[PDB]
Amino acid sequence: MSDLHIPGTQSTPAIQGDWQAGRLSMQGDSYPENSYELFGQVIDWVERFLADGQRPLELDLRLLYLNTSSIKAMMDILDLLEEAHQGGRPVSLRWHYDRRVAELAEEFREDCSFPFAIQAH
């Protein structure tokens, strides 16, 4: 029932899991030394949110640089969402970026069957 709240740092993104709104938000860069230490709890929170109810989950991402292990961690989250979506769970994602090509976002989008908006600002 609790929210997820990871404060951002120079090398790790700020992450907010809003349980009641069914919103998972992330902002910043992600080049931690140990990405599963940072994202394991996020994967867990998403798993629990999907298991404890039927409400929709929305991801709102404002991620900048992602190192290799962070790319793998996000693919794991997206794969959880995709599995849930194929089961009929409403899932949607917004990927914000500043034009000043979102190539990584487009590659992730090709792996997802739920609405996945790549949005310049």
Author numbering: 24 to 123, 127 to 147
How did the manuscript describe this experimental structure?
Here, we show that the SiaABCD proteins play a key role in cellular aggregation and dispersal of P. aeruginosa in response to carbon availability in the environment. With our study, we demonstrated that the protein phosphatase SiaA and its kinase counterpart SiaB target the protein SiaC at threonine 68 (T68) and provide evidence that the SiaABC proteins make use of a partner switch mechanism to balance cellular aggregation in response to carbon availability. A partner switch system (PSS) typically involves a PP2C phosphatase (SiaA), an anti-sigma factor with kinase activity (SiaB) and anti-sigma factor antagonist representing the target for phosphorylation (SiaC). As such, that study is complementary to our data and strongly supports a model that the SiaABC partner switch integrates environmental information, such as carbon availability and surfactant stress, to control biofilm formation through the modulation the activity of SiaD through the phosphorylation status of SiaC.
To gain insights about SiaC, its crystal structure was determined in this study. Native crystals of SiaC were grown in C6 condition of the JCSG+ kit from Molecular Dimensions (0.1 M Phosphate/citrate, pH 4.2, 40% (v/v) PEG 300), with space group I222 and diffracted to a maximum resolution of 1.7 Å. Clear electron density maps allowed complete tracing except for residues 101–103, which are located in the flexible loop between the α3 helix and β5 strands. The SiaC protein comprises six β-strands arranged in a mixed parallel/antiparallel fashion and three α-helices. Notably, SiaC contains a putative phosphorylation site at threonine residue 68 (T68) and as such could represent the target of the predicted protein phosphatase/kinase activities of SiaA and SiaB. A hydrophobic pocket next to T68 is formed by residues L61 and L63 projecting from β4, W95 from β5, I71 and M74 from α2, L107 and F111 from α3 while L66 belongs to the β4-β5 loop. The hydrophobic pocket next to the phosphorylation site of SiaC is of particular interest, as it seems to be involved in the stability of the SiaA/SiaCP interaction. In addition, a large patch of negatively charged surface is present at α2 and α3 near the hydrophobic pocket, and could thus be useful for drug design as potential anchor points. In addition to SiaA inhibition, SiaC also represents an exciting target for interference, as it is structurally most similar to bacterial anti-sigma factor antagonists with little homology with human proteins.
